[PDB]
Amino acid sequence: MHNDKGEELFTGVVPILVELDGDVNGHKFSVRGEGEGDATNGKLTLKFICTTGKLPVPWPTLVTTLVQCFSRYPDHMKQHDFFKSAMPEGYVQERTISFKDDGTYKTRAEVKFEGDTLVNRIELKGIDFKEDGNILGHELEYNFNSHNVYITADKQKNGIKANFKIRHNVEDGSVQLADHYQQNTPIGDGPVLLPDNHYLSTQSVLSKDPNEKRDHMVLLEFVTAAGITHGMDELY
Ligand SMILES: [Cu+2]
């Protein structure tokens, strides 16, 4: 059913739970988020809170770690949606995020259905960060730019890889690059969809809840797949 069970589990609005256990340079922390995704429109709304007090890193640095199965894949690209096709058993998402002239994150997440909730459970380990870098020094603006996520099928596994560079606005007007390497593997055993080269086009809006005492991030996200044109002449 991997050609169809995918889209079907994501019609309408699906609730989301995110759980992050982080350790950056020995500083442990935890984030919980909840909200909902509308895959048909490629729309996510979530609120994350740091449950261990203050967040030891800027919230923007955690955005990409904190559910690409909610992408809007156009109809002519539906057979390239690996993320949904691995559902409900889900997929493992692993990243290496290298911050230029600073430390690196390594992340391992399981993204899967638990009941009617889409869950993203993550472990994050950061090392080699500078005590007064842009990351541990909290020098990054509280905003987020739009990016493409370039996806390719695994050469030999039934998974995908992705590569992209996040651009973090630094509060002195400069830019902090966060190079992303990404690997996704199905948790289950059945077939999945393996995509042609394509990308996820992603846009994010960060805000704050004015009635929120805890360290927190409110996030609205839009994500749609693009870059494959086969099957489209009739639309013009
Ligand atoms: Cu199938």
Residue numbers in the entry: 1 to 66, 70 to 239
What does the article say, verbatim?
MsbA forms a homodimer, each subunit consists of a transmembrane domain (TMD, six transmembrane helices per subunit) and a cytosol-exposed nucleotide-binding domain (NBD). ATP hydrolysis powers a conformational change to an outward-facing (OF) conformation, transporting LOS to the periplasmic side of the inner membrane.
Removal of the first four residues (Met-His-Asn-Asp) of MsbA abolished binding of copper(II), pinning down the metal binding site to the N-terminus. Resolved electron density for the N-terminus is observed along with strong anomalous signal for the bound copper ion and adopts a structure of similar to that for the copper(II) coordinated GHK peptide, a naturally occurring high-affinity copper(II) chelator found in the blood plasma. The copper(II) adopts a pseudo-octahedral coordination with the planar ligands comprised of the amine of M1, amide and sidechain of H2. An additional interaction is formed by the sidechain of D197’ from a symmetry related molecule and similar to the GHK-copper(II) structure, wherein is a C-terminal carboxylate. This interaction represents a crystal contact and coordination differs from the GHK peptide in the axial waters and N3 participating in a water bridge to the metal ion. Given the proximity of the N-terminus to the inner leaflet, the copper(II) bound structure could engage lipid headgroup, resulting in enhanced lipid binding affinity.
